[PDB]
């Protein structure tokens, strides 16, 4: 029954003839029980991913890769599936690889495909797996790990794309137990220009887009608050250069974090003394960094 497809992928299929075979495969997956999916198992899943990477390598047939994504969604739509997608090496990585501004629909299907893994309860820290894998692609071609998620938040993009961006961002924020983490990557985002564009993502009136912001803003705010609660204390104690150096030496000294901090400081200390508006100047950077860590 199932074997018929496993061979079809291995039998060196190609543009157009592949597409067809892939379509039928999806539809067969969806319109079947759970036990028929098992028989496709790891072996079948395997071959699907092989074609993906092989198809990525090459540089008419975006439609060809897309169907393998849809196949996966269909395949993963159950216990067995996702689990066995998770056991793979390049599984989660290739889903990520499918994201991009150039093929709106594929990214759409790739994003929510990952998002549903994040908010998975029992395989703890799935958001960590996703974020790791998200990183690994940013070197093959050497651009930043988030620029996909921001590319699909411009002028031109399908308003359905935008929902799937911020939709992923939430799944890559909510289950994260460490507050430091969430503000970290949220600041990563806004460094690329999320705050420059997030203005426009309220101007658009939508039903499914604004159940997203109503969980994002809910977070970006319940973090900001809780963070002051910690900063406010630091406004009290670290009142003193002494209190600063005291902490700098104890925590930012013999931890790889040092040469970074050292640099930050070196940059800060650049504006020579006798600059009349130096108070004003440092005031300016004050708000810069403050916007960066808080807003």
């Amino acid at each position: 029954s199932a074997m018929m497809y496993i061979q079809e992928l291995r039998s060196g299929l190609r543009d157009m003839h592949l597409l067809s075979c892939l379509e039928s495969l999806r539809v067969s997956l969806n319109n079947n029980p759970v036990s028929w999916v098992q028989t496709f198992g790891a072996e079948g899943l395997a071959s699907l991913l092989d074609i993906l990477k092989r198809l990525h390598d090459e540089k008419y047939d975006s439609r060809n890769q897309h169907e393998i994504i849809r196949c996966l969604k269909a395949f993963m739509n159950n216990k067995f599936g996702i689990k066995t997608m998770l056991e793979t090496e390049e599984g989660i990585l290739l889903l990520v690889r499918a994201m991009d501004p150039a093929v709106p629909n594929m990214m759409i299907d790739a994003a929510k495909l990952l998002s549903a893994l994040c908010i998975l309860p029992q395989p703890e820290d799935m958001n960590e797996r996703v974020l790791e894998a998200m990183t690994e692609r940013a070197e093959m071609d050497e651009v930043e790990r988030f620029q996909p998620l921001l590319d699909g938040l411009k002028s031109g993009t399908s308003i359905a794309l935008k929902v799937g961006c911020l939709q992923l961002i939430n799944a890559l924020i909510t289950p994260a137990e460490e507050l430091d983490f969430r503000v970290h990557i949220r600041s990563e985002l806004m460094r690329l220009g999320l705050h420059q564009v997030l203005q426009e993502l309220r101007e658009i009136e939508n039903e499914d887009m604004k159940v997203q912001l109503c969980v994002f803003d809910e977070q970006g705010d319940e973090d900001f608050f809780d963070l002051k609660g910690r900063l406010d204390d630091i406004r009290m104690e670290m009142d003193d250069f002494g209190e600063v150096f005291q902490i700098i030496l104890n925590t930012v000294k013999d931890s790889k974090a040092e040469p970074h901090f050292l640099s930050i400081l070196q940059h800060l200390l650049l504006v020579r003394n006798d600059y009349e508006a130096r108070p004003q100047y440092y005031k300016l950077i004050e708000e810069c960094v403050s916007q960066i860590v808080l807003h």
Binding site: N77, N78, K79, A116, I119, N170, V215
Partner: peptide
């Protein structure tokens, strides 16, 4: 059919 339940409860997200 499972990951659909996780998908709708995503746009209309009560899985938070």
């Amino acid at each position: 059919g499972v990951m659909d339940s996780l998908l709708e409860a995503l746009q209309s997200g009560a899985a938070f």
